[PDB]
Write a protein that binds this ligand. Structure first.
Ligand SMILES: Cn1c2c(c3ccc(Cl)c(Cl)c31)[C@H](C#N)C1(CCNCC1)NC2=O
Ligand SMILES: Cn1c2c(c3ccc(Cl)c(Cl)c31)[C@H](C#N)C1(CCNCC1)NC2=O
Length: 331
């Protein structure tokens, strides 16, 4: 029904000619357009689904990008540039600079092969620098995931594996981003990248994004998420498998007391769900594919990003100084 107003050859705002579909989902559709009033430049246009959740997210996204784009006009910190917005047949339309495939789409269209370590380093630095800029501007993204990290240009080499020519990224999808001064929603983040303080409803802020990035880097390294579940209890069980027991102070503070017996997770290891967790999940370091010190440095950084206590958890400002990033500074 939304597709009635975003077919290729359709013209939006009497200038943007749809030439292709870049993404679609519950949120709506992103389309590649020729901009006939900017010399035929190609742009991206997000056509927002006509439902509460997405309309409100889009109105907020527009406000956040005005502020971030004004603040960083050169896009030194790699937040996508919003060119304008307008309304088309009742749909909110956000115009962006054109970006390439998401890191997710790249992984998938590569048959779920992981990224090479040298690209992971360069991507992890740009993601930490980008989201650190949010964090310096009293913002938390809340929804970082591979689908929200896009390549600037996703052209690749193909050999006996696709390899990006340029692994430069930008960060998109700012409709959930929350200012420090705002009242915080309870359910933030996509299941698989959600921080323990969010699941336990302890309150969250910038550190929940650090957790999400830790989950992202391990997914780039493995080609699969390390938290493959749709259940809060199971998710906490997986965290315990990979990172050890939760701190007692977070158990004691949570209203979700039923999840815990004495001060440990009430979880049958020997149930069908318990065997699933023991199969798919194991201690973090056992996920390393080489003992090579560069792989150890990456895993040290991920471990600090997956610190349970969001106060002790490494900041992105600290992450940028991590030794894992020295091979970028060898110049
Ligand atoms: C392909 N694509 C997509 C987004 C873009 C935002 C900006 C730009 Cl330039 C592009 Cl190409 C986007 C969206 C945002 N924000 C999301 C919205 C839903 N989460 C993933 C990013 N989906 C896209 O396909
Ligand atoms: C600027 N803004 C914001 C929200 C909007 C919802 C609807 C609309 Cl029309 C706007 Cl302008 C919104 C949401 C609320 N309440 C959130 C969206 C993202 N963080 C949580 C609440 N914060 C806003 O400042």
């Amino acid at each position: 029904s939304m597709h009635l107003i975003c077919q290729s050859g359709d013209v939006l705002s009497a200038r943007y000619e749809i030439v292709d579909t870049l993404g679609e989902g519950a949120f709506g559709k992103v389309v590649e357009c020729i901009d006939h009033k900017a010399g035929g430049r190609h742009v991206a246009v997000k056509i927002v689904k006509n439902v509460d959740r997405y309309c409100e997210a889009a109105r907020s996204e527009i406000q956040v990008l005005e502020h971030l784009n004004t603040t960083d006009p050169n896009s030194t910190f790699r937040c996508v540039q919003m060119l304008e917005w307008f309304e088309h047949h009742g749909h909110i339309c956000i115009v962006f600079e054109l970006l390439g495939l998401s890191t997710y789409d790249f992984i998938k269209e590569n048959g779920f092969l992981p990224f090479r370590l040298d690209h992971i380093r360069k991507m992890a630095y740009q993601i930490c620098k980008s989201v650190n800029f949010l964090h310096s501007n009293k913002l938390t993204h809340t929804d970082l995931k591979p689908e929200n990290i896009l390549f600037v240009q996703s052209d690749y080499t193909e050999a006996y594996e696709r390899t990006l020519i340029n692994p430069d990224i930008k960060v998109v999808d700012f409709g959930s981003a929350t200012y420090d001064d705002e009242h915080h929603s309870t359910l933030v983040s996509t299941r698989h990248y959600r921080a323990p303080e969010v699941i336990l409803a302890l309150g969250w802020s910038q550190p929940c994004d650090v957790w999400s990035i830790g989950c992202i880097l391990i997914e780039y390294y493995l080609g699969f998420t390390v938290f493959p579940t749709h259940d809060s209890k199971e998710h906490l069980a997986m965290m315990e498998r990979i990172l050890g027991p939760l701190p007692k102070h977070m158990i004691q503070k949570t209203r979700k007391r039923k999840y815990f017996h004495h001060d440990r997770l009430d979880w049958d290891e020997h149930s069908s769900a318990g065997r699933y967790v023991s199969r798919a999940c194991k201690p973090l370091k056992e996920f390393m594919l080489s003992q090579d010190v560069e792989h150890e440095r990456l895993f040290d950084l991920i471990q600090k990003m997956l610190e349970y206590d969001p106060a002790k958890r490494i900041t992105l400002r600290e992450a940028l100084k991590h030794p894992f990033f020295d091979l970028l500074k060898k110049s």
